[PDB]
């Protein structure tokens with residue numbers, strides 16, 4: 001699946017890994033993350049992520 005980078009801290013949201021420590025199962029698309037999910041490292045909102053693709 002796709003990977004997204006936090007433009008603040010460099011955390012990679014890997015859709016294949018999800019974010020289970022914060023309620024997100026592996027395989028959850030970025031678009032499907034709750035609106036108020038934040039970067040688990042720096043706390044940045046979803047707005048600050050960019051998808052890693054051309």
Ligand SMILES: [Co+2]
Pocket residue numbers: 006007008009010011039040041042043044
């Ligand atoms: Co971050």
